[PDB]
Amino acid sequence: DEENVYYSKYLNDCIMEAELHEFFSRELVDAGYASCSLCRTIDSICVIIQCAEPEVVMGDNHYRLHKIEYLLAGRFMCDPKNFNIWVDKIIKRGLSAEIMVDNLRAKLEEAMPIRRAAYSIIRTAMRAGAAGCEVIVAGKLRAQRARANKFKEGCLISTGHPKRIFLAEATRHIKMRQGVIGVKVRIYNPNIRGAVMPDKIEIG
């Protein structure tokens, strides 16, 4: 028959992964939240969360990862010990846009001149080896009228499939006092271990 209900549970698991990425973003954003992946073994769920600061995520005595394990399992109808979470560290932090955008969001709420902070984020990705970084801050920046302040440094690419692979992007709705501003950090890493630019011809 074509019933094949195996696809339906696969879909249900991915929907939980989307919820997981949304819950972690609200709580573990201070704790360097970048991304989550769900793993199902023999009826076992273990989530890999990529974070800049695993120690805050873990907590002292790992009571914070335990309390949130108990919560996520309790929410997803699992029992603790039938599931667990695993937190990994982020290396070359600048190339991670989600980490950079929350760094920008912090310095903007710390009342730093915007262009000063934007070049600071750009330099943290420039140090990391990104070919370019593009910061767009849009909102009521000190004025009732809204203007979008685009700051950019080095080459960035915007078209084709190598945008999905080489260019990372990160939007944060930082709620400033006057209304709400939006910070978008984009990093372009020309070189990664796997695929290479489909145009760049090396020529010896």
């Binding site: 249900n12 929907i15 989307a18």
Partner: protein, 49 residues
């Protein structure tokens, strides 16, 4: 009060991410909003050509 509180029984299908009744995408399991869905489709993995 409970005699009439929600005495009408009808589907209250609502987007899982938003909570909005209008335009719930019940194509399969997903009950996601149409304005809520194209936002998180990369996390669900749906992608375009």
């Amino acid at each position: 009060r409970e005699t009439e509180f929600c005495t009408h029984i009808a589907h209250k299908r609502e987007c899982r991410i938003c909570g909005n009744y209008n335009s719930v995408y019940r194509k399969y399991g997903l009950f996601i909003c149409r304005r809520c869905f194209k936002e998180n489709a990369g996390k669900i993995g749906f992608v375009k050509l």
